[PDB]
Amino acid sequence: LKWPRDLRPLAHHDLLYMGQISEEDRGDFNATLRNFLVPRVVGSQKHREVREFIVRSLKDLDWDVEEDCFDGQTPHGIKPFCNVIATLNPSACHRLVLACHYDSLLHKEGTFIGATDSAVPCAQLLYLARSLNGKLQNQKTRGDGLTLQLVFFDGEEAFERWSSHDSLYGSRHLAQKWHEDRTSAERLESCLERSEIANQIDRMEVMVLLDLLGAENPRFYSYFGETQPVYRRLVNIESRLNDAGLMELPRRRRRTNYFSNSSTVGFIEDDHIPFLKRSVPIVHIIPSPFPDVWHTLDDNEQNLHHPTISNLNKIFKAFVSEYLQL
């Protein structure tokens, strides 16, 4: 079956513009990132500060920001959780959803920063909103029934040994909440002709979940046949950015090959699962294998690879520009 939205290839001019990172932008990205490079375990003050920073940053860009807050039982007793949902144009029927988790693992060995997991993805989402704000605010005025939505899930991490009951607290909660929140096309602005909308879940046109990003030379694959048409756009954008000489590599004439033009057979537990179960299309931008530093005390700022981050930011900016025709 074809993708429901006809995917217009990004014009050369727009590819080149989205693939430019100024010195200012690097500074802006890193300043944003600094806010997330702190331990932010559920229940903590720094976690509350990170949540408030996400909310403030997006309200400042005139996005609609909602907090889905609830208390949930855990192996460590009742804990407070708050998903942050930011929507550029709430009334637009369909959403391109980008997502990540903002909580950090409570690591028994010691203080855990979770730089790839997922401080970098958090900063990448905010950086996208900030750096594309002008074009996004113009797109919002079109009445075309499509918008951008950012979801920062809380409580993705297990408190003790991973289980279905001890993990994905925020995403399980939100998926249920949105499934039970009924709506229809006539209540919404410009749904696509043959859309089947019965609840808020159905308005998630695709969810692009970023996780474990920031390490050198990640390998992505298409995890879901459902979203192969969208995944192939990431492969294409990456290829075009290399053709254009806009990727940072250690030597001339090398190319990035992050997005493999292949599928892989693997099952990863992450925030997409509760939405996958309600047939939300998923693109899971997570490396395979996981970064070497995964769930170790070395998942910290200095083990980040800045040229990779810059390259990923270009791909993501170009992807959002392509999808939303910015």
101 - beta bridge partners? 153
Q: Kindly list the distances between the CA atom of residue 199 and the CA atoms of 11, 41, 152, 175, in Å, as whole numbers in the listed order.
A: 35, 32, 21, 11
Q: In whole angstroms, what is the distance from residue 32 CA to residue 1 CA?
A: 40
6 is in an annotated binding site: no
Number of domains, the chain:
1
Please give the backbone phi and psi of residue 137, each rounded to the nearest 5 degrees, phi first. -65, -35
Residue 32 · residue 24 · CB < 8 Å: no
Domain extent for 62? 1-326
Long-range CB pairs of 182-189, under 8 A, 24+ apart, other chains included: 185/93, 188/91, 188/92, 188/93, 188/145, 189/89, 189/91, 189/92, 189/93, 189/143, 189/145
Q: In whole angstroms, what is the distance from residue 325 CA to residue 138 CA?
A: 11
Per-residue three-class SS string for 145-203: CEEEEEEEECCCCCCCCCCCCCCCHHHHHHHHHHHHCECCHHHCECCCCCCCCCEHHHH
Query: What positions carry a catalytic annotation?
Result: 156, 211
Residue 145 · residue 94 · CB < 8 Å: yes
ω into 118 cis (within 30 of 0)? yes
35: its two tokens: 């806010």
295 is in an annotated binding site: yes
117 is in an annotated binding site: yes
Q: Structure resolution in Å?
A: 1.6
**Counting beta carbons within 10 angstroms of the beta carbon of residue 2, is it exposed (0 to 12), middle (13 to 18) or buried (19 or more)?**
exposed
Within a 13 Å sphere around the CA of 212, how many CA atoms are in the beta-carbon half? Answer: 23
